[PDB]
């Protein structure tokens, strides 16, 4: 019951999936061959970790996950890597030719050749569930597959599963690690196409993560491996309420109720603490009060933007580890005194809090210190729209000269789809302005 199916799309989605599933295995005590000695029910069960793992008669715990990419070389590393036994081969799906950083190839020319096979494999996972809750979809904004195939997939999932919930983890581009000049086009196209199909989307700004790795972990030039280990901790924080239970645990769906006041306003800002190196964490106790305060420091946000220049519509705190109610209540009291957190006039101001007692885990060879307690704040702030404005501006610069547009038109797209997508983004920015205005 309450199963969640994860779908990892394109290089970024797949590589982040690697990092997340490895971390989940460590958190639950699952070996790379999928055995879990602590699990006494063989071949099934309804424990909390079963929302994310099915089981075979032979004791294997198998991710409820599909990996899909339009070329094989990234998923091939999964197929031959450390966790190769973890996945059934049919969960790992590849084509031969990728989308070449072109939304149109991912959604149409190339994506159309594999979409039916992908849905068939998702259906096999869905059939195993006794109460499927929804999907978690991981993908880049910038890549041709991450943008175009994800959009196609989300549209097809709405048809095949109706309003079954679909959440996204979406990688927002940064120039330090970007690989295509047309990423703003792909970003706007996929955000427009997916908007009415997604219930909640957590944007992960690669520049924010890049900065945190440089500044907090003293990593000179972060790699995708550095970025993805940090990202996976944030994803783990957010999915922890689904995978563990405890008296103080609050389900992700309850946070979602508070976080989404209108269907289109569904992009929470995540902020995570503590991000600290072993060297600096040694002989340093980071209290509940300290990690909570860090949630309101924009340096720790997953998306670059300034909530102090915006208004809040909701604030959720997701704690894990050695965290007791009295300390959380005292920390929030302090914050409400010292920080001006301004809410819109039509929302209550109380923070919604969940606590999971299982402490954070780290993967061997990482740069993150292992800590006794951590927190992820999820906030609904008008400031998140800053991220749209930056992308929309880059789109506008190129589109005004129709730069690169012929690559899309040559694959069957029309200029009307570009302008329609950009107009939807203009309307989204206007929606975020409007919810911030005081009531009459």
């Amino acid at each position: 019951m309450r199963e969640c199916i994860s779908i990892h799309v394109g290089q970024a989605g797949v590589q982040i999936g690697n990092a997340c599933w490895e971390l989940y295995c460590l958190e639950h005590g699952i070996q790379p061959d999928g055995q879990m000695p602590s699990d006494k029910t063989i071949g099934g069960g309804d424990d909390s970790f079963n929302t994310f793992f099915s089981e075979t008669g032979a004791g294997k715990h198998v991710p409820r996950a599909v990996f899909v990419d339009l070329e094989p070389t990234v998923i091939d590393e999964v197929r031959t890597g450390t966790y190769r036994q973890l996945f059934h081969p049919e969960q790992l799906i590849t084509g031969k030719e990728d989308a070449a950083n072109n939304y149109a190839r991912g959604h149409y020319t190339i994506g159309k050749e594999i979409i039916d096979l992908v849905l068939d494999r998702i259906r096999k996972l869905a059939d195993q569930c006794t109460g499927l809750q929804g999907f978690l979809v991981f993908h880049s904004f910038g890549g041709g597959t991450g943008s175009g195939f994800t959009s196609l997939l989300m549209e097809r999932l709405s048809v095949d599963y109706g309003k079954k919930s679909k959440l996204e983890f979406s990688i927002y581009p940064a120039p330090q690690v970007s690989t295509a000049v047309v990423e703003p086009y792909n970003s706007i196209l996929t955000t427009h196409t997916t908007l009415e199909h997604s219930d909640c989307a957590f944007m992960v700004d690669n520049e924010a993560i890049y900065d945190i790795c440089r500044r907090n972990l003293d990593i000179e030039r972060p790699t995708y491996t550095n970025l993805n280990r940090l990202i996976s901790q944030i994803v783990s924080s957010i999915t922890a309420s689904l995978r563990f239970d405890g008296a103080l645990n609050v389900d992700l769906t309850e946070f979602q109720t508070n976080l989404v006041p209108y269907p289109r306003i569904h992009f929470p800002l995540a902020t995570y603490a503590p991000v600290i190196s072993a060297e600096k964490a040694y002989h340093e106790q980071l209290s509940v009060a300290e990690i909570t305060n860090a949630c309101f420091e924009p340096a720790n946000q997953m998306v670059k933007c300034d909530p102090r220049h915006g208004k809040y519509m909701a604030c959720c705190l997701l704690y894990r580890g050695d965290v007791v109610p009295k300390d959380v209540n005292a920390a929030i009291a302090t914050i409400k005194t010292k920080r001006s957190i301004q809410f819109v006039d039509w929302c209550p101001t109380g923070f919604k809090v969940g606590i999971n007692y299982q402490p954070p885990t780290v993967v061997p060879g990482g740069d993150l210190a292992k800590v006794q307690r951590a927190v992820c704040m999820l906030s609904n702030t008008t400031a998140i729209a800053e991220a749209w404005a930056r992308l929309d501006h880059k789109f506008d610069l190129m589109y005004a000269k129709r730069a690169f547009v012929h690559w899309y038109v040559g694959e069957g797209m029309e200029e009307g789809e570009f302008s329609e997508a950009r107009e939807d983004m203009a309307a989204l920015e206007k929606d975020y302005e409007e919810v911030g205005v005081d009531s009459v």
């Binding site: 019951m1 109460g131 309850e254 109720t257 508070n258 909701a314 109610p325 929302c347 209550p348 009531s439």
Partner: protein, 430 residues
């Protein structure tokens, strides 16, 4: 043998419902296995009001446990008194209601409600002379609030001449950060105004403030809150459960307490206020009980009774005490504060005394007020409702289940009308 059928719905409903059954089972000398082991005939004389008899002289609560998710009921079945309940009377789904009144009332709850009514019917058929129903639920969630009021309406259709009584837990931002609770509560109050005979307004705002201010609990828990609720539920059902003259059944209570059909929302109070395991050694005097039971600080609804007027009052004293002193003190409250009792309902305060004290106390007193000050509670909910509704905020969760905005407007209008009707009788002169 005037039977009451008890229903408890949703998380809050089952939590306080289970505590109610623990508390009154102990009072009646019934152990977790259903065996009687008490020392007084007073304990069994009206035991059939709340319990069925089995063979082996087992006593089984006439209780139906309802939820749209299994968690709380699994908790209950694994609690101390889990075995006492009739296993077939556990009626539950798997989907949950996601704190959503529409899911409880219209979609998820609708799929489960016939199963519940089947159990209700089996219990009612077994009754020598059924009085009516009591329901425990919160108004702020989805199952207790939405499915609870759905059940109330369906039961009224099948049993239209029976009394419907609820213990209804009102939401407060002091205790919950779920943003949609004022929507759920307003939709529910609309249902309660129309379909219950008596509703005890159990306010989480008041419960929290008693724990924090008076009991000096710095981090109140639901356990602490529910300790107050189960003390109150024990006190207000005492006249139903033990031999007595006054308010001895649900209908006689309603006729004494409800002068106009919509104004049937009661402010309960209790003295002495205690925390769990405080275990205090000095009994209160009759004057102390009387002063404290009428005090604002002892009310289970966060309303200042000095801001309104009492339409009607029931007071229940428990323990061995002088009935002469009780009468004297009760008269003193009325004669000393006569302006707070409407003058156009003569002798509107009734007093009962029961010899059997609650567990852990030598002396206690329970207050039931029909006060116009209860409008403050509905005003509080209404303000929270309108702050969101003026921007149609969070409505998509409800319209996604098939609801229209018009239904919200009608519920809001009905509750604002209720508020205005209290004010009307507050200002009314003889």
């Amino acid at each position: 043998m005037r039977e009451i059928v008890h229903i408890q719905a949703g998380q809050c409903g089952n939590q306080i419902g289970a505590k109610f059954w623990e508390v009154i089972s102990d009072e009646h000398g019934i152990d977790p296995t259903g065996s009687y082991h008490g020392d007084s005939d007073l304990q069994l004389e009206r035991i059939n009001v709340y319990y069925n008899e089995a063979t082996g002289n087992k006593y089984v609560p006439r209780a139906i446990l309802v939820d749209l998710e299994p968690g709380t009921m699994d908790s209950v079945r694994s609690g101390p008194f889990g075995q006492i309940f009739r296993p077939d009377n556990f009626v539950f789904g798997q989907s949950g209601a996601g704190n959503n009144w529409a899911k409880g009332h219209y979609t998820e709850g609708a799929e489960l409600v016939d199963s519940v009514l089947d159990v209700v019917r089996k219990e009612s058929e077994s009754c020598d002379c059924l009085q009516g129903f009591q329901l425990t639920h919160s108004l702020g969630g989805g199952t207790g609030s939405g499915m609870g009021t759905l059940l109330i309406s369906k039961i009224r259709e099948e049993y239209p001449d029976r009394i419907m009584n609820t213990f209804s837990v009102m939401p407060s931002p002091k205790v919950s950060d779920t943003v949609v609770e004022p929507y759920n509560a307003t939709l529910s109050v609309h249902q309660l105004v129309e379909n219950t005979d008596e509703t005890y307004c159990i306010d989480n705002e008041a419960l929290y403030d008693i724990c924090f201010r008076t009991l000096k609990l710095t981090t109140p828990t639901y356990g602490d809150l529910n300790h107050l609720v189960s003390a109150t539920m024990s006190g207000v059902t005492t006249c139903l459960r033990f031999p007595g003259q006054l308010n001895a059944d649900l209908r006689k209570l309603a006729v004494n307490m409800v002068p106009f059909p919509r104004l049937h929302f009661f402010m309960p109070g209790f003295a002495p206020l205690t925390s769990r395991g405080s275990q205090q050694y000095r009994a209160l005097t009759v004057p102390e009980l009387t002063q404290q039971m009428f005090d604002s600080k002892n009310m289970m609804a966060a309303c200042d009774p000095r801001h309104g007027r009492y339409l009607t009052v029931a007071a229940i004293f428990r323990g061995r005490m002088s009935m002469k002193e009780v009468d004297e003190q009760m008269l003193n409250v009325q004669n000393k504060n006569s302006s707070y009792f409407v003058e156009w309902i003569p002798n509107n305060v009734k007093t009962a005394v029961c010899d059997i004290p609650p567990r852990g106390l030598k002396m206690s007193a329970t207050f039931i007020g029909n006060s116009t000050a209860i409008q403050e509670l509905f005003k509080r909910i209404s303000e929270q409702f309108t702050a969101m509704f003026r921007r149609k905020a969070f409505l998509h969760w409800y319209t996604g289940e098939g609801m229209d905005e018009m239904e919200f407007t009608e519920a809001e209008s009905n509750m604002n009308d209720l508020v205005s009707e209290y004010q009307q009788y507050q200002d009314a002169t003889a």
